[PDB]
Amino acid sequence: PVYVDFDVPADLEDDALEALEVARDTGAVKKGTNETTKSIERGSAELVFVAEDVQPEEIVMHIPELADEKGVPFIFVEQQDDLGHAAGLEVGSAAAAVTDAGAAATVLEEIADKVEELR
RNA sequence: GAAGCCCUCACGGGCAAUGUGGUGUCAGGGCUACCUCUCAUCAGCCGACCGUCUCGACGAAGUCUCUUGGAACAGAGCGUG
Ligand SMILES: [Mg+2]
């Protein structure tokens, strides 16, 4: 909400999550805000996911701007538990980072484009 | 970075990426490359002596003489541990 500056259409979110699932199987993904943060910092991040139902918002507030000054692309997900499930967790997750896609580097790269365009 | 914890005989359930658990805590630590090594620390097993306080068992040698007296545990005499 305070860290969310644009709205992601339901359909776009689906493609993104789908991509994430194939990312855990084919490529590599980091689950958890701390682990995600280090990707953006270490630059190993290609696409980071951030839930919008996070409370306290503090836990994620930094993701956006941090990602911006690191060139890393990021997309918003409405449900915290969907991102967790999509990441392959039995629990939810406030943030995830696709650290080098897998059999999705295409669809992924394009999701990043759609978002950049979503302003 | 799920390698973790709680309940339950089990099955099963619950917690946990908003981080369980590993590492680590100024002889600073981590990371990378090395040297040597462990006897530090931490976790868990076992598990007292002595002392002190109280309680209890066992535990030596006269119940002799005369006098006074209601009564000798007194006086005088003899004897014992
Ligand atoms: Mg520890």
From Swiss-Prot:
InterPro entries: eL8/uL1-like (IPR050257), Ribosomal_eL30-like_sf (IPR029064), Ribosomal_eL8-like_CS (IPR004037), Ribosomal_eL8/eL30/eS12/Gad45 (IPR004038), Ribosomal_eL8/Nhp2 (IPR018492), Ribosomal_eL8_arc (IPR022481). Keywords: Cytoplasm, Ribonucleoprotein, Ribosomal protein, RNA-binding, rRNA-binding, tRNA processing. It is found in: Cytoplasm. Belongs to the eukaryotic ribosomal protein eL8 family. Part of the 50S ribosomal subunit. Interacts with protein L15e. Probably part of the RNase P complex. HAMAP family: Ribosomal_eL8. This is Large ribosomal subunit protein eL8. It comes from Haloarcula marismortui (strain ATCC 43049 / DSM 3752 / JCM 8966 / VKM B-1809). The gene is rpl7ae.
